């Protein structure tokens, strides 16, 4: 989540005074080239380096990845609601996440670099196979980066993290 190791250079700037979604590129600044769902969406020649996705009211969504002088970074699944990607569903106040890669090994989840869905002492956080259930979703509390990975493997070794922001 907070870390960029594993080629997860694309991050969301959560220092916005206005409800605009800004994406950041953690590469050696020479020129930042942005892509959206594989297609290039911008090329920052010095000066600015953050990419504005617009107002968060517009539900910005897509797989965003950047590129400096090295090869393209891993994508950052942005999903605002105010390669197979993570599946997002909202039902009432319940938010359910679906693992894109569910080979049937034990799937674990982490929310802002914090394990979740493991303890059964949480009625509002249920994990069922490749699906994570988040009941009574708190927009300010349950939003952020989410990541799933299989036992024995590293969360940073995931193909991508999911940035979830939902008003329910």
């Amino acid at each position: 989540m907070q870390s960029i190791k594993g080629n997860h250079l694309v991050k969301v700037y959560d220092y916005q005074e206005d409800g605009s979604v800004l994406l950041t590129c953690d590469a050696e600044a020479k020129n930042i080239t942005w892509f959206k769902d594989g297609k290039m969406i911008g090329f920052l020649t010095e000066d600015k380096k953050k990419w504005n996705l617009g107002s968060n009211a517009k539900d910005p969504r897509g797989m965003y990845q950047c590129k400096g002088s090295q090869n393209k970074s891993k994508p950052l699944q942005v999903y605002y609601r105010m390669q197979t990607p993570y599946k997002v569903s909202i039902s009432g106040t319940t938010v359910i996440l679906t693992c894109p890669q569910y080979p049937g090994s034990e799937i674990l989840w982490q929310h802002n670099d914090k394990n979740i869905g493991g303890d059964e002492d949480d009625k509002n956080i249920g994990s069922d196979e490749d699906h994570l259930s988040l009941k009574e979703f708190s927009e300010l509390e349950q939003s952020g980066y989410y990541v799933c990975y299989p036992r024995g493997s590293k969360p940073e070794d995931a193909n991508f993290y999911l940035y979830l922001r939902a008003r329910v």
Partner: single-chain antibody
Amino acid sequence: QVQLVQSGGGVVQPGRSLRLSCKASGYTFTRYTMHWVRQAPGKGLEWIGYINPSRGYTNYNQKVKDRFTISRDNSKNTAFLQMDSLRPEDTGVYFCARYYDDHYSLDYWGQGTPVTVSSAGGGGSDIVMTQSPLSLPVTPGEPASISCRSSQNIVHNNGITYLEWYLQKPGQSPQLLIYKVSDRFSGVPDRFSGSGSGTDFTLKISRVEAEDVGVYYCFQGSHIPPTFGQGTKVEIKQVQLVQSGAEVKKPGASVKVSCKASGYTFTSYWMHWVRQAPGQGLEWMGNIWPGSGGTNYAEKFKNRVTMTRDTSISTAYMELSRLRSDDTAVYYCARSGGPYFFDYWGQGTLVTVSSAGGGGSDIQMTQSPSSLSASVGDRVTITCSASSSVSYMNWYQQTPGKAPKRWIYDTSKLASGVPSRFSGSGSGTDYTFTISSLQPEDIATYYCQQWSSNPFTFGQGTKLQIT
């Protein structure tokens, strides 16, 4: 000090079942995954499976997921691995190891429990009724003689020698031929006849025609588990128990093969339920006294088969659960008679089971060299090749007779106590383990391990010796 105590190993007959216990101490047993690893003699470490004690989540290697059962007791901080249908290939040292999710490594390994699969108790529990000739071809009109010898003396305390020689003509229900050692079945012609005592008995088929052609498979009777023989297939040199239909499933699925009963008071004759593994002999699976729903399930299937009764509809089911690759069989559902076990038999519902397999093939690790001899102080380099890219590599040191100890985690991080002379390096599918200065204390077997994907894959192990 974190302590893992393996218990329950020993010698058991092939096919028998064994349950092991791993007591975990020094830590919160629910906080770390407990995985099972077996080291067969001459073989490297094979990951068997794991159980998440907090979640109960279990995974098993495809080789034993249908024969091994991983269990745990949180109140006892102990894990149980139920090993059923024990086979000679499973003889070895079984070790329990703690998964420290933080290091993506098995950090603590228990001292391990040896398991040896061999005929220690074989022939005692069973009664190996081997049959003398085998596939003896007989020309018509000749006095063919097929004998069978019993691993014990089959003479029950009642004194009735309940041998029987049930003859199965091609593609047909087993049909009983000599009721006890020397009677004959009503309607079984006098052409067949038999004699015997003690541990050797035999039947002389004085005149043989086309009809007797088939295999004469000698049952046992006094032996507590009925035990039918290998099968000497002789070749050339009403009350009807209706079965259910041919079904084909995939591994681990469930079959309910039914037997409808007609012509005899269903709750008056125990519907003992044989099985016939193709290319093997018949073996009782478990009875059911349709009167009271009592089952007396057999040992080799004691925890996979459930045979219930429905007296009203005159049908008897036999729910075999968690089918394994070799359960493919024709489950003839016969009626356990008065003076002869397995009197009149059913059609039989062949149930051939063979799934694709799933995780049979996984990441493969190759360690080179397999054996290395070096002088004290020499720099030794060991290479480990994975069939697919792995995020982190683990190195384990195994001294002769001692448990594997994690030596490097995360492909470069040395475990607590590891001398700095040891070093691990690599990424993707190539990793290196380097000892800068060999010391006499370093003689052991070294293995590289991948955990990125289940099942965890270990290299063949490098034997390091001092010249």
